[PDB]
Amino acid sequence: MGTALDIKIKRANKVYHAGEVLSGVVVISSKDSVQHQGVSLTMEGTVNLQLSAKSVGVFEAFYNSVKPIQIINSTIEMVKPGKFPSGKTEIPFEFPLHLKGNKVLYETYHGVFVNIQYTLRCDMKRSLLAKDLTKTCEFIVHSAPQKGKFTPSPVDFTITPETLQNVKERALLPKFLLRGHLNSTNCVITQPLTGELVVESSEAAIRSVELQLVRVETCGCAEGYARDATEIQNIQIADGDVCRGLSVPIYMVFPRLFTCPTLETTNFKVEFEVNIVVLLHPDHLITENFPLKLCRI
Amino acid sequence: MLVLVLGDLHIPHRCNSLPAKFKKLLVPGKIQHILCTGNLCTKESYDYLKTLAGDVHIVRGDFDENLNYPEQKVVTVGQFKIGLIHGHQVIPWGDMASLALLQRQFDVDILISGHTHKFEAFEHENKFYINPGSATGAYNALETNIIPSFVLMDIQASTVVTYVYQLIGDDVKVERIEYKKP
């Protein structure tokens, strides 16, 4: 019969901080007692630079695409040939968050064009009662509290059809008066946004007012940088025709791992933006974006 | 032990009120047994009695309505017996020894009766028979005035203290006897 092995990272989030000690358990669990030629484990961190295929040109994009640069790799062996009880066995390991690797220990970031990962790989050289097992984990590293401390960055915007810039449809857009506010365009990666948004005139009712986020990631190539954005948030904040003269509030608990402090590097870039899309009842559509720079402490 | 005894009062048709002073006399709860020879003709009155004390022992009479109320009944407490009738149920009014036979019918030592309209007390040898005529003075040309009369008793072993009431106006008169288990 076969065997199962599993990796436990102590901190239930599998999140570790710059300068921390890294801690993990490996679990062996089985219907039958376990013997192996050994159990072997790697820890890794990577940034993955997916130059956008059409943006560079697909072949050149993948050629240049800096596929997961190992931020870090330290390697250890955890158990020599050993024989163990069935239901559980657990042996401990640690790895050092120190540059046994290419680049200075970024935070795990599951972006798209820029991806950043930290990962482990295991093998148990099981007794030939059964095959050697190979297993992998993925885990988050978090940045240390930054040298530059936070301060809030409130910003306001006012909207009517005339306010709009290069909008093809300005004449199509019906009468309205709006003002929008962000309580701090400085925001912490894991932590919440607050904003105010007034409707104080409208000729038109609305079916959807959307409040939306874009993540934008860039990879470098020896000739060029290719920059690509993806959108993932929505709260739609309209039901029934919005009263004129009122303010409505803006809320966001910043997306858990698909978002980070705004990143800019020699090899890759990641910037963030806030988007606005309004689907009126006549559905004349207006859109405004602001770009964001984000912090961790 | 407090035990109440009263004759027929025929309430709805002859005597729709407790006498005012007799109303004044009302004492709920303290009665251990409420005893009437019936012929009140309203159980609602009895229900009021039960509200006075929930311990009523009953016989029927003429047109008291639960004619299911006994044929003969006896209660015995301490050293004494207490057998009760409404007279229509019994041998005639004044045949003294046949009315002594009644006790042997039952095997008892007393009877209380309340149908003959006067209030009565009679024994000649050992065993004794009593009538509390009518506590409302109920109809019968018989007596020119049934000064309404009832007895109540306290029971004490071989002795019974008895109080024996009469009503004349704001004049209420009372007698007392003791029965000696003699």
Place this chain on the structure above:
Amino acid sequence: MAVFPWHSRNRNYKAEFASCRLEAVPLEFGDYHPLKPVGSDFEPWTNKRGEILARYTTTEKLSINLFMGSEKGKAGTATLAMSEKVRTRLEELDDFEEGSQKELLNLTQQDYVNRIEELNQSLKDAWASDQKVKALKIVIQCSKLLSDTSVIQFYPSKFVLITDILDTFGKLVYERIFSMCVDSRSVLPDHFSPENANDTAKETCLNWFFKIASIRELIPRFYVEASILKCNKFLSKTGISECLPRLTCMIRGIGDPLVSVYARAYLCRVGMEVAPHLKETLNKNFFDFLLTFKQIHGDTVQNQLVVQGVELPSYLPLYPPAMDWIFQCISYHAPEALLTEMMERCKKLGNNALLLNSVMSAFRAEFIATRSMDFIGMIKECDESGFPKHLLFRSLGLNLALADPPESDRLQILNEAWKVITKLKNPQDYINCAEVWVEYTCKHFTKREVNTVLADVIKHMTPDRAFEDSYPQLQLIIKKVIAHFHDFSVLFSVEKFLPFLDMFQKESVRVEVCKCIMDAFIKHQQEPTKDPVILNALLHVCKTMHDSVNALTLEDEKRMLSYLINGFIKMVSFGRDFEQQLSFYVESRSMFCNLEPVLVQLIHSVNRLAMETRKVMKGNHSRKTAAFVRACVAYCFITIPSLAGIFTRLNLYLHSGQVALANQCLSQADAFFKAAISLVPEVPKMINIDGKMRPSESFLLEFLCNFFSTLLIVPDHPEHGVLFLVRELLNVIQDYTWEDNSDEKIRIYTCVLHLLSAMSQETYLYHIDKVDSNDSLYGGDSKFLAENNKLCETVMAQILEHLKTLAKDEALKRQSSLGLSFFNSILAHGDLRNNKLNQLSVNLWHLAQRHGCADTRTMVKTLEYIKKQSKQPDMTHLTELALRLPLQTRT
């Protein structure tokens, strides 16, 4: 042998008294004698919910048309990654909306309920199956059902049900997260710190919360997050508070007025339940609500009403349930100053009339009452289309019934409301609001105000069948009158109530009220008297009910009603109006044939009267008194044949007899008794009472000795056999087909012999003034005395026959008891110095003992006692007997 010649003793009843008498103790003045001296005032959701679910049906043909994903989910080659796998978790929640639909147009109420319950089961399964993702899917389905307001009048019910389901869901959610926090050792306390939620429970709650924040649609995100605010107990007690004004601002996003209002109502229920400060944040939400009302006038309502063409009078009913819940929530213990300021903003607003209605409904009576004068104006400011002012009236009538301003203010308001209300022509709406106001009107105002209301309502009734539809209101009205009204005569002073009664048509309803009427009379009236006009009206109603009665009505109800009537009849008391009261009886009888007990008690009244009448006259008897007597005699007589109950009628012969003895009427006596004996054949073998069968012989026999108590007292007439009839009576008896078990017949024979013992005296026992004694009339002497002796001896022979037959019958216990009882009867008077009777006594004693069945134990007790009695003079031949007596025994 010839029958042994009986001779009785003779008694000295005073001597027998002295020997028997207790010579009691008269008691003394003042001597002792025994009698000598959230908080539950917040009304629950269930009540509101039940009532709403009753009312807020709609005419619209319901439909369900919804994408579903109960069976299926994604499996395609989508572009995904770890982040996108996290997104794919939510895509599971999307897939029901990506899924195909169930479509059901023109649903009825119950079909919609059933489909919603299908979804309810789907959710219950997803929960029980731990398909918490799928449970969340189905909760999102609930929120999209909330999204469909289109059947707007039914839609409040839709909201109600979805909120109930999602409340259960939120409860379940909290319990699950707690169980994740709980290590199953014991459940954590409710006051648990947010830090007490363990790291994994915290992160799971965080994941689901992020899902919620990531809800794209406003409706699910807000409404569910309101339930997750409970989960904040896991995460932050203060976070609950932080969220509530946050929700307040968040609520601003919903331009849909119904959804937003009802969202507020839900959040009020929650906030009130959780903690006190939450009510203050609800005040902040009311501050928002003022602007919500501002929009409620605005474009959304106008546009949508135009789109459907729906009438605002139809539209208006949907909201007050939410309004009233909210008003309960805040006003529950809001101060009068606060409620007043709230009214300030509401008055600052326009077209507020429904707002005012809900305010009066919820807000507290002392506060409302003080303002009530202001309300005269402020309601005049209202518009019926803002809210119908008569409905304002009705709610207010509830309020005023509860509490009222000063009496002057009451007077003014009386003028304002009633005068306005009289204007209102629709009798249905008029009666609807008026019936509410009636209780408060009864509370303060008096006969003329009442008479006015009477007039206006009677004018409003004219499509009277609708008035008859409105009978319940009228009933409630008059009950209010009754409770409030405490002088019968002043009702008669109103009089218009009599036309009020006349308006009616349905007998039973009228009767129901009459029931109320008379019991109330029983409460207030306790004194028997007369008022001829009052009487005449009452008697008219008596007529009404009596004639209302068919043969067919429920017997026991008939009985009780009659009882009720009979009770007031005792009240009938003219005083010295003897012949007038007499005539009254006459009429009463002459109509009111319909129930025997009524008749019975009537006759009681006759008897009571006549009895006292003789008692007062005390020999001073005028010719008038004699005519009075004989008239009574007839009247009571003529009743007797008409009566049903044979036994009762027989004792009525008794009553009739004894009153005839009370004066004259001796032939009338005879008449009663000819009837009595004629009733003897009329005796059935068995008699049904209570549905149950009983054996008559007892009851008649039981009577018959009490009747013997009479029978010798009566003098009669050598024009007849002076009581030939009594022999004849007894003959009929003997002819009657008693059981062999009617040894009791013979027991009565004994009793008759007791009577004959009375006949034996030279002086009878006791007497009434003008009826003395028969003994004198025939003369007691051996020739006529022998007449009765002879008859006794005849019956004695009969006795002997039967008893020895009982020996043949093995009725040995019966026979022995009977014979010895008879012996004890003899013992009253039997001469056994008459050796023949003496031997008779020997015969009885031994022949009873001879078969051993006789309770000889009691006989030994008996005979020792008889020896003790034997000491006495006649008993000295009993002394000779009882000494000579041997005794066969059980012992």
Place this chain on the structure above:
Amino acid sequence: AMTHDEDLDRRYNMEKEKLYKIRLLQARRNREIAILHRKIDEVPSRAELIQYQKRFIELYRQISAVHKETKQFFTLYNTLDDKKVYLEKEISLLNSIHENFSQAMASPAARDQFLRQMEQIVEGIKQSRMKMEKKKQENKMRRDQLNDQYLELLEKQRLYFKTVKEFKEEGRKNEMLLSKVKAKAS
């Protein structure tokens, strides 16, 4: 004392029996008096007789109604029973027919005879029904005659009251004529 005692009892007994003889006199005279009182009672007071008649009057009313109702509901029951009898025949024929129907298909000659019989049956039934309908119309005409006569005599009555008014005018006229006669002539 014994002589004295004997004398006392002798005298006592003597006057006792003499008193018994007196008691026979008194019993006899009592009997006579009671007879007289009986005779006196036998013709009661008209005051009472008034109530006697009142009782009779109410009896007249009561009994007349009683008989009326008696007839009403007696005939009502007769009616309900008669209709029940027709229910009975209806059920009998239906089930007999349906069972015969279960047999009826034996042949075309049987078919012919069967349908001929059905024709004859429904015809005779119609005949009876129509007899009873004609009887209904007869009673209808009866009602017409009666109603009309009633309304006629109702008018005759109202007219009679009008005639009462007319004569009262004639008498008032008479008395006024007398008044002028005495005013002018006398």
Place this chain on the structure above:
Amino acid sequence: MEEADRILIHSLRQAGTAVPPDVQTLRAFTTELVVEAVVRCLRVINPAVGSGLSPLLPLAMSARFRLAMSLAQACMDLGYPLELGYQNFLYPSEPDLRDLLLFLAERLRELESSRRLAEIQELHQSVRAAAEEARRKEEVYKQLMSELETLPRDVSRLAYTQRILEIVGNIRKQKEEITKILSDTKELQKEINSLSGKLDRTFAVTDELVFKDAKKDDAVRKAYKYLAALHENCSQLIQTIEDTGTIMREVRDLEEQIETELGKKTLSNLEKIREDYRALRQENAGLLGRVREA
């Protein structure tokens, strides 16, 4: 009104008005004799009112009018519910007059010796009482004999008591018959309910069967047509039954109304008033002539 017919006699005797034994119903009466008794009895009850007019018949019709109008006023003294006036006094229904008349009738050794002592004392007391009673008996007897002498030869209580007895028996008979009828009613209802159930099943079966075999042959469809025509005949006739029964009820109502006017006696009294009116017009023509001539 058999006993009230006898009260005609009783009341006449009570009045002292002539009591012709041939006078046995209000049909017998002249209104004049009625009014004579009215004069008697009003002069008894209220002589001040009743003595004001002679019991003698006014020959002058006008005087009859005027006196009767005074009688109307005498009744106007009192709350009699009915209308008053000489028109009534001539031509009532006999009940109406009866009713009023009643409304009138309304208004008109050691121990042994000691015991000898007690014996003789008691005998003494007894003889005393017996003597007193002898006085009582004889003076009463003297009175009673004088009364017997005065005694009216009027009708005994018994005769009426017997009439009563008869009446009672009849009535009770009625109620008993009524009771059995009530039972019978209940029984028939039970029977009919059963009939309803069995008939409902009977038709359901018959309809289904004939439908099934009518499928087999259009002639059996004609058999179904026969069934329908016959059944409709039955339903119609049942309705007709209901109708006719009701009709005859209303017929009895009409009969009640026949009796109603018969008690009114309207037409005969109308003929009387018409010929009266003729005479009174002749009289009034005499008066008119006299008014002219004066």
